[PDB]
DNA sequence: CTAGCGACTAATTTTTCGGTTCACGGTCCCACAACTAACGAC
């Protein structure tokens, strides 16, 4: 900005706002309505997660009884529904690996993968 | 629970080869066609 390459920013109107983790209040799971209930800044919500019993289902589980961490989430609204993007801060995975053993990784627009690993090729 | 704060395409021309025309001093073997000399009938 002070040689001048940026312009400032003119942000849209479809914007998703933001709204912090001081606001999430009153989460349970309401299971007569089978949904999630909460307030965001003094109004209920049922939370729609559909044939989703597995996926997102252990993790909001995983706050109300304060075992993740959520960050400043964002929400948008995209004609008559509603969307939560909740930045939950998940943990790396663990698994067997080689340091030694190397992956041979090409990328073109004909083959959009290729990819080496001693004899096996993907 | 909320608020303050850290140049490419089409049209026209021209030319070599083919077509046409004129038209006087060995062997051995198995069949097939003659064929003829003799034989029998009228």
């Given amino acids: 900005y002070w040689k001048g390459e940026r ?3 003119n942000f849209k109107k479809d914007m998703a706002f ?3 983790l001081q606001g ?3 989460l349970v799971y309401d299971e007569e309505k089978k949904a999630f209930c909460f307030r965001l800044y003094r109004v ?3 939370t729609y997660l559909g044939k989703d019993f597995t996926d997102k289902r252990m993790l909001l ?3 109300v009884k304060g075992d993740v961490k959520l960050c400043a989430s964002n929400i948008q609204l995209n004609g008559g529904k ?3 993007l909740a930045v939950f801060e998940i943990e790396k ?4 690996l080689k340091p030694e053993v190397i ?3 090409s990328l073109s627009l004909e083959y959009p993968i290729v990819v080496k690993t001693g004899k096996n090729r993907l």
Wanted: charge should be positive; charged fraction near 30%; glycine fraction near 4%.
């Fill in 82 to 84: 509603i969307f939560w």
């Fill in 18 to 20: 933001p709204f912090g």
């Fill in 24 to 26: 999430i209040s009153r």
């Fill in 93 to 96: 995975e663990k698994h067997s």
């Fill in 44 to 46: 209920p919500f049922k």
């Fill in 61 to 63: 589980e995983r706050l």
């Fill in 7 to 9: 312009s400032l920013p």
């Fill in 103 to 105: 992956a041979e990784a």
